[PDB]
């Protein structure tokens, strides 16, 4: 069952990003805090939509896609990925990682249903690395 | 109004890009016409230093994110 | 049977030569047009008498004679010339090429009678080459600079014109045009060409690149 | 049998390009007019040599080559090209399109002899598109 | 002092590179810290024309020799 | 047994590079001289460390690595390389070429022990080509004019130097040198070359003619 | 009148040659006397720069066309 | 077996030519010194390439060709030339004197193999006379 | 004295040649040394217009009479 | 037997050349008068030495040599020259015409001994034509 993040925590994090900036160690610590439980693509996408401005959000979408593509290359380079399965029918496509696959587009409940925990942690680590890249790039 | 947005003489580029993308996406344009308009507004607004910086791009930039990344890389630190 | 060229076409060509000059590509195209069917020495001689002034006509007579002499040397160097025959009795003398042979002097009908089609096409090609020589002679690339206010397409036009209408071999024009684009073409475009992530190996490619990335002003 | 274009029409078109420019709709209409019958590579090459200046002519040679290369890629992607034949012996090389093949270099009569009508119309459409590109680029 | 070296307005790039590499290698830095410092000094010194020339490098330059070669290739002849 | 190069020769070569530069033909001849016997990586590395400045030395290290990599690609493309052996156990790695392999780092004696003569000559040729590249890189013909007070032999020397040390094809240098003699070389010599009763078709002939008929002053 | 034709100080040589050949061929001279007269008028008219240019001809010019070609080759571009 | 001249002697001679000039008696003495043993066309050509500037080198190539042509005229005027042989098959062509013949172009070893000692001394004397002419002409 | 003879700024060339040949032949030189001296005095005296006229001689003049003829042909009429 | 020309006539002719010039018809008539009998090279040479200045004398020596060379070319083009003979042993060299041959240098008596009347008239006509050329050239 999907539970959304508190809008109070999200508002506090947005104001933190607004006053301290993207690169301060306190901001990265707060992001790591709100990045503790494995989030669904819907959660991370809306979170970055709210806390980041338009141009940093575009940059972050780009960087997140690139990092997820590196993850999928490593996944096709190793059939023992915690997102993959043993047979070929469990291979994870980027539509399933970005939340674009069938039964997931716009629906967080179905998303949480079909996604694997390894998928969730890989998406989360990818999003964190992308946030780091964009923060280092913006300023 | 998006077509009246200029990058101020003292304004940074990320603020100008934020303002422009906001005004273009929150307007009456179709969804399929926002990216070309944002690109062509980056090229013609964004005072002539950044205009020449985008003009002399050895690669072809075909996305607002790519233009923003390129300009942020090669911008005149000041 | 000999048919003369229209005096209307000849008058139009003469006025073209009068306004555009001898060397314009439109003039050379018009001459190639009126040089389509193989002409008899009478036709080409009268044509050059009408379209060219006195001094260019003298120069053209000289050049035509020289080119015809080269043709006759190649003909005596190969008995299989389309103007020649197999036996020695068909060897073509310059009196027959210039229309000076017996039964031809001043008479275009007899001319058309005795002349061969290979003779006609050789005379025609010789006259065309002579016209080209005289046109290149009648009217400096290394002194061409792009002015401070001049656009780049005008500079490229002027430079390519002066380089192609010069004494360089044909195989040396493209490298010279490129290296003149790089060293002339005032330092803004010089730096624009220098910092080219791709290697430009043709004047057209350099022109396209510069037109794309030029400073709009 | 090859018939050349009238130098009167070519002179009028050259003066049109000289006064109105390359991009005016009247100029493009005039070019479409003189581009009505399928022209041999010799015809189009001399036409562009006369009506265009040196630098636009270089640009046009480049663009024409690129468009012809796209055409030849589509031709090797479909053996039913009106320029191609059914067997492999009728495949059309760029030397045959640009007029550089054997029996064609400098000779318009032989050109008209060996060329196909599909070849002619493809060359003509390629030249028209290249003219459009160069006109959009020059000004 | 290496951190005070700037490329003069009229100085060529090979002279500036010689002076900078001399002052960096003849200093108190560890041997494993000279190449990154030389690179980052090429990027921030070396007046803004060469700064932008290095910034807009389609390839990633990870050695002072490679940076010198690239700049010598694409430099503005003047 | 390893024998070092004389520091006297190295000092003379360093001063030659200091006064004449990297690209002079005398400097390249001197380098070819000191590049006669096959050198060990230690020798060439120290030689370039001494004769070259810091930035040219960095450039040369880069170029030497690239050329050695091309050599190793050709070596893996042909098992009959004079550096390679017949079996796979003699394949030569870049650590062995750059002197980085085991038993060689910093020790020239062990280096000379384990290295092959084919290895040595390949390293030497690679280093020579890298030196040529860096020399061509470290340091415009169409901008050369004969000064009002400059003599003609100095102008000809400067022009031929800049034309031959440029990016032109080899078959385009003589026509360019001639046409630059004709259009540069201030109008007195321009008219002197123009009014040549003979046709001059070589830079040497033009130089001889001008030196004969020049205005002594 | 052919014997009154001079090359003006600012006139080019091809115009002078055209005018002179016109006036000599459209005159009362016999046909066999036109070429020598045209040559000797090229030599004595045609202001002293071209006069000296024709005088110092290493080859012997025996035809108006050859003289015109030589002068056009070696003329002072101005 | 071919042995090259020392680059040290060549460097000293080049600096002598640079400071004293081409016509000084000390320079001519030094050239006579380095012109002691019969040199192959490769040696003399590279020597003049190094010690002479570009324009004097062009002049010297011209003069050397002219003097070699005079030598070949004297050789066809006397079948007892130390470069010639008794039969017609040993007649020496200018391609063999200038080093342009077959098996000699660019290869000094093959050059030294096929050349005669009379050929070498004739080439050397010709080069010396050409150097004298160019030195008298340059200044 | 022959070695002090110069062609005056206003003097014609035949007068200068007469004076020079007179002073050279009526001097203490050997008979076999008069022609080379007369030639080399024509070349170095005879003010720079005629000096350049003799210098740019497409033919080689090896006799005082030939030099005099050439100069009289191609001299600047004034 | 050689008889010299009167110094009185030579003085009168020299003063005529001095007052009237070289080109006057009276001067040419006087020269034709003193050019009536066939003169030996000594006579004409001394005559031109006396009547002409130094520079006209140099010009006249040049022109006389050229005309004598044309005469000798015509003589080798026709073995029936009044100066030549029938066999090859009577062919007339320029040393015999200019008075430079053996037994003639400086001696007018020996000159008159060995010279032919055809030789004398050819020398005389050559000298007259050379005088005409120099007179037309001097003014």
From Swiss-Prot, chains A, D, H, J:
Compartment(s) of residence: Virion
Residue numbers spanned by region Involved in capsid protein dimerization: 42-50, 103-114
Subunit-structure text: Homodimer. Homomultimer. Homohexamer.
Task performed by this protein: Self-associates to form the irregular polyhedron core composed of hexamers and pentamers, that encapsulates the genomic RNA-nucleocapsid complex. Assembles as a tube in vitro. Binds to inositol hexakisphosphate (IP6), which allows the assembly of the polyhedral capsid.
Record's protein name: Capsid protein p27, alternate cleaved 1
Origin species: Rous sarcoma virus subgroup C (strain Prague) (RSV-Pr-C)
Gene name in the database record: gag
């Amino acid at each position: 069952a999907w539970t959304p993040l508190e809008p109070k925590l999200i508002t506090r994090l947005a104001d933190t990003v607004r006053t301290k900036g993207l690169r301060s160690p306190i901001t990265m610590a707060e992001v790591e805090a709100l990045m503790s439980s494995p989030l669904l693509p819907h959660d991370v996408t809306n979170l970055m939509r709210v806390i980041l401005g338009p141009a940093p959000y575009a940059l972050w979408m780009d960087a997140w896609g690139v990092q997820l593509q590196t993850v999928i290359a490593a996944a096709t380079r190793d059939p023992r990925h915690p997102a993959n399965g043993q047979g070929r029918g469990e291979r994870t496509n980027l539509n399933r990682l970005k939340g674009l696959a069938d039964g997931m587009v716009g629906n967080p409940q179905g998303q949480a249903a079909l996604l694997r925990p390894g998928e969730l942690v890989a998406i989360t680590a990818s999003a964190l690395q992308a946030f780091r890249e964009v923060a280092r790039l913006a300023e």
